[PDB]
Design a protein around this nucleic acid. Structure first.
Ligand SMILES: [Mg+2]
Ligand SMILES: [Mg+2]
Ligand SMILES: [Mg+2]
Ligand SMILES: [Mg+2]
Ligand SMILES: [Mg+2]
Ligand SMILES: [Mg+2]
Ligand SMILES: [Mg+2]
Ligand SMILES: [Mg+2]
Ligand SMILES: [Mg+2]
Ligand SMILES: [Mg+2]
Ligand SMILES: [Mg+2]
Ligand SMILES: [Mg+2]
Ligand SMILES: [Mg+2]
Ligand SMILES: [Mg+2]
Ligand SMILES: [Mg+2]
Ligand SMILES: [Mg+2]
Ligand SMILES: [Mg+2]
Ligand SMILES: [Mg+2]
Ligand SMILES: [Mg+2]
Ligand SMILES: [Mg+2]
Ligand SMILES: [Mg+2]
Ligand SMILES: [Mg+2]
Ligand SMILES: [Mg+2]
Ligand SMILES: [Mg+2]
Ligand SMILES: [Mg+2]
Ligand SMILES: [Mg+2]
Ligand SMILES: [Mg+2]
Ligand SMILES: [Mg+2]
Ligand SMILES: [Mg+2]
Ligand SMILES: [Mg+2]
Ligand SMILES: [Mg+2]
Ligand SMILES: [Mg+2]
Ligand SMILES: [Mg+2]
Ligand SMILES: [Mg+2]
Ligand SMILES: [Mg+2]
Ligand SMILES: [Mg+2]
Ligand SMILES: [Mg+2]
Ligand SMILES: [Mg+2]
Ligand SMILES: [Mg+2]
Ligand SMILES: [Mg+2]
Ligand SMILES: [Mg+2]
Ligand SMILES: [Mg+2]
Ligand SMILES: [Mg+2]
Ligand SMILES: [Mg+2]
Ligand SMILES: [Mg+2]
Ligand SMILES: [Mg+2]
Ligand SMILES: [Mg+2]
Ligand SMILES: [Mg+2]
Ligand SMILES: [Mg+2]
Ligand SMILES: [Mg+2]
Ligand SMILES: [Mg+2]
Ligand SMILES: [Mg+2]
Ligand SMILES: [Mg+2]
Ligand SMILES: [Mg+2]
Ligand SMILES: [Mg+2]
Ligand SMILES: [Mg+2]
Ligand SMILES: [Mg+2]
Ligand SMILES: [Mg+2]
Ligand SMILES: [Mg+2]
Ligand SMILES: [Mg+2]
Ligand SMILES: [Mg+2]
Ligand SMILES: [Mg+2]
Ligand SMILES: [Mg+2]
Ligand SMILES: [Mg+2]
Ligand SMILES: [Mg+2]
Ligand SMILES: [Mg+2]
Ligand SMILES: [Mg+2]
Ligand SMILES: [Mg+2]
Ligand SMILES: [Mg+2]
Ligand SMILES: [Mg+2]
Ligand SMILES: [Mg+2]
Ligand SMILES: [Mg+2]
Ligand SMILES: [Mg+2]
Ligand SMILES: [Mg+2]
Ligand SMILES: [Mg+2]
Ligand SMILES: [Mg+2]
Ligand SMILES: [Mg+2]
Ligand SMILES: [Mg+2]
Ligand SMILES: [Mg+2]
Ligand SMILES: [Mg+2]
Ligand SMILES: [Mg+2]
Ligand SMILES: [Mg+2]
Ligand SMILES: [Mg+2]
Ligand SMILES: [Mg+2]
Ligand SMILES: [Mg+2]
Ligand SMILES: [Mg+2]
Ligand SMILES: [Mg+2]
Ligand SMILES: [Mg+2]
Ligand SMILES: [Mg+2]
Ligand SMILES: [Mg+2]
Ligand SMILES: [Mg+2]
Ligand SMILES: [Mg+2]
Ligand SMILES: [Mg+2]
Ligand SMILES: [Mg+2]
Ligand SMILES: [Mg+2]
Ligand SMILES: [Mg+2]
Ligand SMILES: [Mg+2]
Ligand SMILES: [Mg+2]
Ligand SMILES: [Mg+2]
Ligand SMILES: [Mg+2]
Ligand SMILES: [Mg+2]
Ligand SMILES: [Mg+2]
Ligand SMILES: [Mg+2]
Ligand SMILES: [Mg+2]
Ligand SMILES: [Mg+2]
Ligand SMILES: [Mg+2]
Ligand SMILES: [Mg+2]
Ligand SMILES: [Mg+2]
Ligand SMILES: [Mg+2]
Ligand SMILES: [Mg+2]
Ligand SMILES: [Mg+2]
Ligand SMILES: [Mg+2]
Ligand SMILES: [Mg+2]
Ligand SMILES: [Mg+2]
Ligand SMILES: [Mg+2]
Ligand SMILES: [Mg+2]
Ligand SMILES: [Mg+2]
Ligand SMILES: [Mg+2]
Ligand SMILES: [Mg+2]
Ligand SMILES: [Mg+2]
Ligand SMILES: [Mg+2]
Ligand SMILES: [Mg+2]
Ligand SMILES: [Mg+2]
Ligand SMILES: [Mg+2]
Ligand SMILES: [Mg+2]
Ligand SMILES: [Mg+2]
Ligand SMILES: [Mg+2]
Ligand SMILES: [Mg+2]
Ligand SMILES: [Mg+2]
Ligand SMILES: [Mg+2]
Ligand SMILES: [Mg+2]
Ligand SMILES: [Mg+2]
Ligand SMILES: [Mg+2]
Ligand SMILES: [Mg+2]
Ligand SMILES: [Mg+2]
Ligand SMILES: [Mg+2]
Ligand SMILES: [Mg+2]
Ligand SMILES: [Mg+2]
Ligand SMILES: [Mg+2]
Ligand SMILES: [Mg+2]
Ligand SMILES: [Mg+2]
Ligand SMILES: [Mg+2]
Ligand SMILES: [Mg+2]
Ligand SMILES: [Mg+2]
Ligand SMILES: [Mg+2]
Ligand SMILES: [Mg+2]
Ligand SMILES: [Mg+2]
Ligand SMILES: [Mg+2]
Ligand SMILES: [Mg+2]
Ligand SMILES: [Mg+2]
Ligand SMILES: [Mg+2]
Ligand SMILES: [Mg+2]
Ligand SMILES: [Mg+2]
Ligand SMILES: [Mg+2]
Ligand SMILES: [Mg+2]
Ligand SMILES: [Mg+2]
Ligand SMILES: [Mg+2]
Ligand SMILES: [Mg+2]
Ligand SMILES: [Mg+2]
Ligand SMILES: [Mg+2]
Ligand SMILES: [Mg+2]
Ligand SMILES: [Mg+2]
Ligand SMILES: [Mg+2]
Ligand SMILES: [Mg+2]
Ligand SMILES: [Mg+2]
Ligand SMILES: [Mg+2]
Ligand SMILES: [Mg+2]
Ligand SMILES: [Mg+2]
Ligand SMILES: [Mg+2]
Ligand SMILES: [Mg+2]
Ligand SMILES: [Mg+2]
Ligand SMILES: [Mg+2]
Ligand SMILES: [Mg+2]
Ligand SMILES: [Mg+2]
Ligand SMILES: [Mg+2]
Ligand SMILES: [Mg+2]
Ligand SMILES: [Mg+2]
Ligand SMILES: [Mg+2]
Ligand SMILES: [Mg+2]
Ligand SMILES: [Mg+2]
Ligand SMILES: [Mg+2]
Ligand SMILES: [Mg+2]
Ligand SMILES: [Mg+2]
Ligand SMILES: [Mg+2]
Ligand SMILES: [Mg+2]
Ligand SMILES: [Mg+2]
Ligand SMILES: [Mg+2]
Ligand SMILES: [Mg+2]
Ligand SMILES: [Mg+2]
Ligand SMILES: [Mg+2]
Ligand SMILES: [Mg+2]
Ligand SMILES: [Mg+2]
Ligand SMILES: [Mg+2]
Ligand SMILES: [Mg+2]
Ligand SMILES: [Mg+2]
Ligand SMILES: [Mg+2]
Ligand SMILES: [Mg+2]
Ligand SMILES: [Mg+2]
Ligand SMILES: [Mg+2]
Ligand SMILES: [Mg+2]
Ligand SMILES: [Mg+2]
Ligand SMILES: [Mg+2]
Ligand SMILES: [Mg+2]
Ligand SMILES: [Mg+2]
Ligand SMILES: [Mg+2]
Ligand SMILES: [Mg+2]
Ligand SMILES: [Mg+2]
Ligand SMILES: [Mg+2]
Ligand SMILES: [Mg+2]
Ligand SMILES: [Mg+2]
Ligand SMILES: [Mg+2]
Ligand SMILES: [Mg+2]
Ligand SMILES: [Mg+2]
Ligand SMILES: [Mg+2]
Ligand SMILES: [Mg+2]
Ligand SMILES: [Mg+2]
Ligand SMILES: [Mg+2]
Ligand SMILES: [Mg+2]
Ligand SMILES: [Mg+2]
Ligand SMILES: [Mg+2]
Ligand SMILES: [Mg+2]
Ligand SMILES: [Mg+2]
Ligand SMILES: [Mg+2]
Ligand SMILES: [Mg+2]
Ligand SMILES: [Mg+2]
Ligand SMILES: [Mg+2]
Ligand SMILES: [Mg+2]
Ligand SMILES: [Mg+2]
Ligand SMILES: [Mg+2]
Ligand SMILES: [Mg+2]
Ligand SMILES: [Mg+2]
Ligand SMILES: [Mg+2]
Ligand SMILES: [Mg+2]
Ligand SMILES: [Mg+2]
Ligand SMILES: [Mg+2]
Ligand SMILES: [Mg+2]
Ligand SMILES: [Mg+2]
Ligand SMILES: [Mg+2]
Ligand SMILES: [Mg+2]
Ligand SMILES: [Mg+2]
Ligand SMILES: [Mg+2]
Lengths: 47, 272
RNA sequence: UCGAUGUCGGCUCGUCGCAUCCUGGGGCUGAAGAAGGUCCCAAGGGUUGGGCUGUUCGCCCAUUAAAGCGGCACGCGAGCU
RNA sequence: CGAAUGCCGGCAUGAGUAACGAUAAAGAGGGUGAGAAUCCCUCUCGCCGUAAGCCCAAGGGUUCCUACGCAAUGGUCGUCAGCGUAGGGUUAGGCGGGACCUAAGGUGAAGCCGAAAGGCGUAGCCGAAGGGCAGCCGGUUAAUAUUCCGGCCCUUCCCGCAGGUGCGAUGGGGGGACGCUCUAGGCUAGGGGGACCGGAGCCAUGGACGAGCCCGGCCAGAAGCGCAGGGUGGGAGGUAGGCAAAUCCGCCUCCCAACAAGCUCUGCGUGGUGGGGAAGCCCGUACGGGUGACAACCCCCCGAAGCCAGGGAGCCAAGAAAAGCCUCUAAGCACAACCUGCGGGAACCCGUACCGCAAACCGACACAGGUGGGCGGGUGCAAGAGCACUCAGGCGCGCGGGAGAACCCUCGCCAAGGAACUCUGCAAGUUGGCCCCGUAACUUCGGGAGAAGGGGUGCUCCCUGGGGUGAUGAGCCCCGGGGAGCCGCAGUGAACAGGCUCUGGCGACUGUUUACCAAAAACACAGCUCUCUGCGAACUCGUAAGAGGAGGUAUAGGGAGCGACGCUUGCCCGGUGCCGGAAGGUCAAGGGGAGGGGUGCAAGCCCCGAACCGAAGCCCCGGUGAACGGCGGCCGUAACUAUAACGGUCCUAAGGUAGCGAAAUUCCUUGUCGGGUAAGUUCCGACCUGCACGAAAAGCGUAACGACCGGAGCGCUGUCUCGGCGAGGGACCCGGUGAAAUUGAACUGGCCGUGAAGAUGCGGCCUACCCGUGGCAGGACGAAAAGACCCCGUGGAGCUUUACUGCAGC
RNA sequence: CGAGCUAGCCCUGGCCAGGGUGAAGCUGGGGUGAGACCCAGUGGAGGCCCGAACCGGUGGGGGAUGCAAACCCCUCGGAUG
RNA sequence: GUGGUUCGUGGAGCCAUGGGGGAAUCUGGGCGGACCACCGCCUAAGGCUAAGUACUCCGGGUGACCGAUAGCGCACCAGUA
RNA sequence: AAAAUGCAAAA
RNA sequence: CCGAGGGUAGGGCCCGUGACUGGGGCGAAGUCGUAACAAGGUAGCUGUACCGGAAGGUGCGGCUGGAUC
RNA sequence: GUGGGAGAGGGUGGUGGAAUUCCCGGAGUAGCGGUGAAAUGCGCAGAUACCGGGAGGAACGCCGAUGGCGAAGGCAGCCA
């Protein structure tokens, strides 16, 4: 069965990456929230 | 004109293809071409604003000359008559004696090797462009500007023309391809003759796929929708329109007249 | 019984009732004989194969000693369809 | 706290129960070790082989190599491991990416728009699996190699000399540069063969010292050269176009080769040289190494979908950009600079282990599922990437041992019968490839067709045709033809491998669909009709700017229905809808103010306020049917009945034409009649009483098509009469590991009663030692899911409209 | 916050063994006043035929605390659009 | 035409303003709840201004606050696995 | 240039 | 080897027969109308097309086998 | 053969004027149409009758005949 998670790395940073969150006031607040909660990662992994 | 086929498959039996003998050489294209951005029906938001579009063969845009007056008085030889995938007509390559090369939409009867020219001078002959005021009343004519120096906007489609029905002051009266009687300004360039490739209306696509190549995706009747979707959606089996027939947006699609009323160009129209 | 008692028909497996279809035993006869009619006793066993239809039922073909009628959640879906 | 299908946690029950994840498959010897079916090595056996082998890309992130380890992970075991600890291991001017280019799209000085957040946007910039760009063969490590080493071969940048030239760009021009189908000539890869060359060694078990058998017989390589191809005209004159300028490019006229002739660029070959190099035998291992050798290193044949490559031809749906590169000139500068040759120096960053059709990626798992490109050998079958077996290489699917019950699953066979089975031939079977003979209605002349239905098929010998390569030959390949004969039940001897025919319904056809219960007669479709839209089009998206439409222009575009094709599509415009109408009626704000009012001494301030003029809309008047839609009733009447061509009359906007009709529509209904069958609620043909067909929500047909639905026949069958036997995987037994829903507590029997109306649990009676195992499903109103049906709730939500009330839009 | 599933479109690439049928055109011969046209060869079209890969998911059986929260077997549809 | 206020169009003034019209400078102008008169109040169409007030990331003090299923989600390398 | 239908069977 | 014939399959022609259906002939006095023969009361006929209970009507073209005071 | 002739014989392209219709304008009223007589219809929203402008299609008056041409069907403004 083809499942729902088909990891590609560029997509991931292209989509949820740091620079992508900071473009959009929606996302800049995401970062704000995430930071205030004290997340160890404000943005998914990397690479 | 209009090549037909023996039914060696179904849908080849009804299929009918244009006649390309009228095409001089040049299968390929003068680098007066330019890439076409295909929309898919979608506008600058990511949105379908015209339904059922896309797929269909790649196309290269032939840039064509809809102002003939920038070149007044410079004649040109008609070098090629070729296929323009972007319009119903065929285009003419013409080599100006200027040395400049340009595309013209190809009038009916204009032949390769012809002398072509545009300006108030001009012979009245196929291919020549003049202002309207200098064209003899009752000559058919095509590629017509609606306003002076804004480019040819009327009678461009295969086999269309317009005819000069008379003059009044600064303006001249045309019968347009629609049958509408319109005042066009005297100063507007037109180019004498009629567009030609007129067997065009007689082609027959013949299979579904052929409609696809032309970039036209399947068209589905509101009748077959549900009511979320269309005014004609619903009702157990089949069912009639059940209301005066409508568009998806709900406005009336049989007879209901949509031209703006208070439009300014009303003063320059006389007809249907 | 709705914090669930799966519904017709079929197939499978039966079991029981008798208001008995057959076979056994009888009385009356408008019973000569053979063959019937009708009532009485009798639940031991038996009670066919097909065409049509989802059908139950029913009609029909070919037979039969007979081709019985009911109950068992209109028996039986933690047995099947 | 005792209950909330409460919440968290712990431990029970089912239970030593199901299962332990593909039925490709195992056996033994030896080794190690506390311990061995499970680790190592050997022999035997089995399984993949267009893979279950090998190489790239994603993705994963140390899983890699090695030493030490076995608590947990591993469905058992474990001495093993993708596991624990530690140590190693990834080497590039040339491979990929970046100090290159542009695609969609993104972003975006300029500019436009938006209450704010923000939305657009030309240039530009970013963006690649596309364009551009210079490395091939070996060897080496336990673990990297186009990366190190070895040989041969290139690239750019910088400095320098020599020679050449108006040098010079982000600007002009050329080029880059393009489809699909079919392809020619020559090569290469790859493969088969060789009586030739090289080679350890073998003669078994009856035979063979043999032109025996077994093994191998190449790889890379600049200049030069050869063969095959790609690209390309040369000179002058004029010049007003290519947004400045060009000597370039375009255009016109001359003249000369039309030919690769040349010039040029690729491919292949050959090349100085470098390097590889089998079986077998012996060691030497978790596998690698030595000899074989001074290895040989050649001829023939088949041959790409790959190369020459911008090759050719046909066709219509008409097939990226930009840079690199060449060229032209501009400022500038011509001590510059650029081109060519040579020489020295300079050349950065990131990736590089390993898995990669999977036990390392996506699927909670060492999951029978999903995952893009390349290579993918041999023989035989017509071909083939099919199928069977098989090299190379890789595997035996991380529980085993037995036993030989019911039952289940997957398989094999069957006397006679042959669809009786059953909603239905569901399922299985039959058929099956190739070559030849043959082949109907009907048809749109293509089809229908593989219609149907037949015959052939192996092997041996003889004679003989033509082709390819060679040479006009031999050998090697390739198609064939003819005669004679041998064997079996059988020659597509195994494997891959249509059952056929008749006949209705629906849909013209190929397509499309409810991912995961519907693939259809639904949707699409070519095509027909209506309608809107003159172009800043209509229409859609957006508050807007903007965009799509469309770089289109009525032969176009948008909306609606109908749905190839054939023959056709009748009557009603009263109502609704749209369309047309300068009058008239009505009508809002506004205009206008007769005339009235509050209040002030008053000048006045301030209020009402009738006429009248006043838009759309509505009203009114027409039109309109491929616009919404609609297309009658009662009574009489013909030689006997019978029926009613005919008449009467009421109503209507007008009363259903053609054609179909018990129908995907017919209630009564299994209508009646015919056909088929021994028998036919279905089926086919009829009739017409059409409950309740009927003409673009089209009517009636139509060849061809269909995993659609109906009916009939032939063929053939374990579907059946009606079962039997056999096979394997389970079920059972032993050793290892060991779940699950469920569960008020249980010391949990039958009948007849009773009871909230269906009792193991109450009464009466009967029957009944205690405890399990394998089996069957009648009951515990068995499990599961707080019934989906039904109602209730002034509970939700999707949908509709001439429900109300708004809003956008117009 | 989501189109790394799925739906459509846009840009750029890749894939489709083998076999079958044999349209137009062209060429030649017949035919004619010239034509239509007929035959033969060539030719190689097609939402054409059979069938792998690939894409499906027709019918049945199995599975049903599964190998699997859609799977396995046999069968079947398309396979140059 | 709207908003604000207790004011939901009401007799609806005040305060703010999107549209239209559009003055005056102390004998000017705004207000006292439609309007008028009279008596009063106030000076629009520029700007600034501590303090008293709100809060608790942080530090301290204190509790008829909790005591590891409580108390913060976290007493423990938790916004972690 | 015209209102207007019909006429039992046999002889 | 050929071979009467038998068997399996697929065509062709002909004859009979079939629910029902199409018209045709004929049949002493049936029903409806008046189309034609006298400008037959619309001159008729006619090929074709449409329509209509029926004869027929109407369109287009044609013929005189019709028509002048 | 050569020289002459008549003709609506055919094919193609153009072109003229009369009239009908519709639309625009102008003036202009109470009716027009139509028949056997009428009605339906058209007209105060300005019809008919009148003038001017324009569009478009078809057919070609007088010549013209009982004539011509063609094999028949058939062929008639004018020009090449
Ligand atoms: Mg998941
Ligand atoms: Mg990526
Ligand atoms: Mg966007
Ligand atoms: Mg379309
Ligand atoms: Mg459609
Ligand atoms: Mg629907
Ligand atoms: Mg929607
Ligand atoms: Mg709606
Ligand atoms: Mg509807
Ligand atoms: Mg529905
Ligand atoms: Mg319906
Ligand atoms: Mg419907
Ligand atoms: Mg229009
Ligand atoms: Mg209950
Ligand atoms: Mg209930
Ligand atoms: Mg319960
Ligand atoms: Mg239950
Ligand atoms: Mg009795
Ligand atoms: Mg008896
Ligand atoms: Mg007796
Ligand atoms: Mg007596
Ligand atoms: Mg007796
Ligand atoms: Mg007697
Ligand atoms: Mg008995
Ligand atoms: Mg009994
Ligand atoms: Mg039968
Ligand atoms: Mg049946
Ligand atoms: Mg019945
Ligand atoms: Mg019976
Ligand atoms: Mg019974
Ligand atoms: Mg029951
Ligand atoms: Mg069941
Ligand atoms: Mg049942
Ligand atoms: Mg409790
Ligand atoms: Mg309690
Ligand atoms: Mg529960
Ligand atoms: Mg419970
Ligand atoms: Mg055990
Ligand atoms: Mg048990
Ligand atoms: Mg058990
Ligand atoms: Mg077990
Ligand atoms: Mg296993
Ligand atoms: Mg196993
Ligand atoms: Mg041992
Ligand atoms: Mg062993
Ligand atoms: Mg094992
Ligand atoms: Mg192989
Ligand atoms: Mg490997
Ligand atoms: Mg990676
Ligand atoms: Mg992982
Ligand atoms: Mg490695
Ligand atoms: Mg390892
Ligand atoms: Mg070890
Ligand atoms: Mg362990
Ligand atoms: Mg273990
Ligand atoms: Mg496991
Ligand atoms: Mg390790
Ligand atoms: Mg180097
Ligand atoms: Mg640099
Ligand atoms: Mg870049
Ligand atoms: Mg760039
Ligand atoms: Mg932007
Ligand atoms: Mg800006
Ligand atoms: Mg842009
Ligand atoms: Mg790239
Ligand atoms: Mg590249
Ligand atoms: Mg590179
Ligand atoms: Mg390695
Ligand atoms: Mg190497
Ligand atoms: Mg090196
Ligand atoms: Mg100079
Ligand atoms: Mg230069
Ligand atoms: Mg340059
Ligand atoms: Mg340069
Ligand atoms: Mg350029
Ligand atoms: Mg260019
Ligand atoms: Mg080409
Ligand atoms: Mg080679
Ligand atoms: Mg070779
Ligand atoms: Mg060899
Ligand atoms: Mg050899
Ligand atoms: Mg030798
Ligand atoms: Mg030797
Ligand atoms: Mg021997
Ligand atoms: Mg070489
Ligand atoms: Mg030249
Ligand atoms: Mg010059
Ligand atoms: Mg020149
Ligand atoms: Mg210039
Ligand atoms: Mg060379
Ligand atoms: Mg050597
Ligand atoms: Mg080319
Ligand atoms: Mg080419
Ligand atoms: Mg650039
Ligand atoms: Mg200068
Ligand atoms: Mg130079
Ligand atoms: Mg150098
Ligand atoms: Mg590496
Ligand atoms: Mg590697
Ligand atoms: Mg690997
Ligand atoms: Mg796989
Ligand atoms: Mg692969
Ligand atoms: Mg692996
Ligand atoms: Mg592997
Ligand atoms: Mg692995
Ligand atoms: Mg993992
Ligand atoms: Mg495993
Ligand atoms: Mg797996
Ligand atoms: Mg996994
Ligand atoms: Mg795959
Ligand atoms: Mg191969
Ligand atoms: Mg092979
Ligand atoms: Mg072979
Ligand atoms: Mg053989
Ligand atoms: Mg084969
Ligand atoms: Mg291959
Ligand atoms: Mg295979
Ligand atoms: Mg091996
Ligand atoms: Mg046997
Ligand atoms: Mg049998
Ligand atoms: Mg038998
Ligand atoms: Mg039989
Ligand atoms: Mg039966
Ligand atoms: Mg039966
Ligand atoms: Mg059937
Ligand atoms: Mg079957
Ligand atoms: Mg089969
Ligand atoms: Mg037949
Ligand atoms: Mg055929
Ligand atoms: Mg057929
Ligand atoms: Mg056959
Ligand atoms: Mg057939
Ligand atoms: Mg033989
Ligand atoms: Mg043999
Ligand atoms: Mg034989
Ligand atoms: Mg076989
Ligand atoms: Mg087959
Ligand atoms: Mg029919
Ligand atoms: Mg279909
Ligand atoms: Mg049809
Ligand atoms: Mg559908
Ligand atoms: Mg489905
Ligand atoms: Mg689902
Ligand atoms: Mg669903
Ligand atoms: Mg299907
Ligand atoms: Mg809007
Ligand atoms: Mg706009
Ligand atoms: Mg636009
Ligand atoms: Mg555009
Ligand atoms: Mg349209
Ligand atoms: Mg339809
Ligand atoms: Mg109506
Ligand atoms: Mg009306
Ligand atoms: Mg109406
Ligand atoms: Mg109106
Ligand atoms: Mg009015
Ligand atoms: Mg007023
Ligand atoms: Mg007023
Ligand atoms: Mg007063
Ligand atoms: Mg009005
Ligand atoms: Mg009306
Ligand atoms: Mg109709
Ligand atoms: Mg109605
Ligand atoms: Mg009536
Ligand atoms: Mg009555
Ligand atoms: Mg009828
Ligand atoms: Mg009929
Ligand atoms: Mg009927
Ligand atoms: Mg009906
Ligand atoms: Mg019968
Ligand atoms: Mg019958
Ligand atoms: Mg029937
Ligand atoms: Mg219907
Ligand atoms: Mg209907
Ligand atoms: Mg209807
Ligand atoms: Mg209709
Ligand atoms: Mg239909
Ligand atoms: Mg039909
Ligand atoms: Mg299909
Ligand atoms: Mg189907
Ligand atoms: Mg059986
Ligand atoms: Mg058995
Ligand atoms: Mg067994
Ligand atoms: Mg007990
Ligand atoms: Mg009881
Ligand atoms: Mg008790
Ligand atoms: Mg008791
Ligand atoms: Mg038990
Ligand atoms: Mg039970
Ligand atoms: Mg039960
Ligand atoms: Mg409930
Ligand atoms: Mg209520
Ligand atoms: Mg409610
Ligand atoms: Mg996607
Ligand atoms: Mg592509
Ligand atoms: Mg092929
Ligand atoms: Mg041919
Ligand atoms: Mg096909
Ligand atoms: Mg097919
Ligand atoms: Mg097939
Ligand atoms: Mg296969
Ligand atoms: Mg492949
Ligand atoms: Mg896929
Ligand atoms: Mg699908
Ligand atoms: Mg399936
Ligand atoms: Mg399905
Ligand atoms: Mg099943
Ligand atoms: Mg199933
Ligand atoms: Mg198949
Ligand atoms: Mg298939
Ligand atoms: Mg196929
Ligand atoms: Mg395509
Ligand atoms: Mg106000
Ligand atoms: Mg308020
Ligand atoms: Mg207020
Ligand atoms: Mg109120
Ligand atoms: Mg107020
Ligand atoms: Mg204001
Ligand atoms: Mg102030
Ligand atoms: Mg303060
Ligand atoms: Mg507080
Ligand atoms: Mg504090
Ligand atoms: Mg304490
Ligand atoms: Mg605790
Ligand atoms: Mg806690
Ligand atoms: Mg404690
Ligand atoms: Mg806290
Ligand atoms: Mg907590
Ligand atoms: Mg912590
Ligand atoms: Mg009469
Ligand atoms: Mg014979
Ligand atoms: Mg015979
Ligand atoms: Mg008859
Ligand atoms: Mg008459
Ligand atoms: Mg008469
Ligand atoms: Mg008459
Ligand atoms: Mg009539
Ligand atoms: Mg006439
Ligand atoms: Mg005549
Ligand atoms: Mg008036
Ligand atoms: Mg007038």
């Amino acid at each position: 069965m083809k499942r729902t998670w088909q990891p590609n790395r560029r997509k991931r940073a292209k989509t949820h990456g740091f620079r992508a969150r900071m473009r959009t006031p929606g996302g800049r607040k995401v970062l704000k929230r995430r930071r205030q909660k004290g997340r160890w990662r404000l943005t998914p992994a990397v690479r | 004109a209009v090549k037909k086929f023996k039914p060696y498959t179904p849908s080849r039996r009804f299929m009918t293809v244009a006649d390309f003998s009228e095409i001089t050489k040049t299968e390929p294209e003068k680098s007066l071409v330019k890439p076409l951005k295909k929309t898919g029906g979608r506008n600058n938001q990511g949105r379908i604003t015209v339904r059922f579009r896309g797929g269909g063969h790649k196309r290269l845009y032939r840039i064509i000359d809809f102002k003939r007056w920038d070149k007044v008085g410079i004649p040109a030889k008609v070098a090629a008559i070729e296929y323009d995938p972007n319009r119903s007509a065929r285009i003419a390559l013409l080599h100006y004696v200027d040395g400049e090369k340009r595309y013209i939409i190809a009038p009916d009867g204009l032949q390769v090797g012809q002398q072509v020219v545009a300006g108030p001078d001009a012979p009245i002959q196929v291919g020549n462009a003049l202002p309207l005021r200098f064209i003899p009343v009752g000559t058919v004519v095509h590629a017509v500007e609606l306003e002076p120096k804004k480019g040819a906007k009327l009678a461009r489609a295969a086999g269309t023309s317009a005819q000069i029905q008379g003059r009044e002051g600064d303006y001249v009266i045309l019968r347009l391809p629609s049958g509408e009687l319109r005042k066009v300004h005297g100063e507007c360039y037109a180019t004498v003759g009629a567009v030609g490739n007129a067997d065009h209306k007689n082609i027959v696509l013949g299979k579904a796929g052929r409609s696809r190549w032309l970039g036209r995706r399947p068209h589905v009747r509101g009748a077959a929708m549900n009511p979320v979707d269309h005014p004609h959606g619903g009702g157990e089996g089949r069912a009639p329109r059940g209301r005066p027939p409508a568009s998806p947006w709900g406005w009336q699609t049989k007879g209901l007249k949509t031209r703006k009323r208070r439009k300014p160009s009303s003063r320059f129209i006389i007809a249907r």
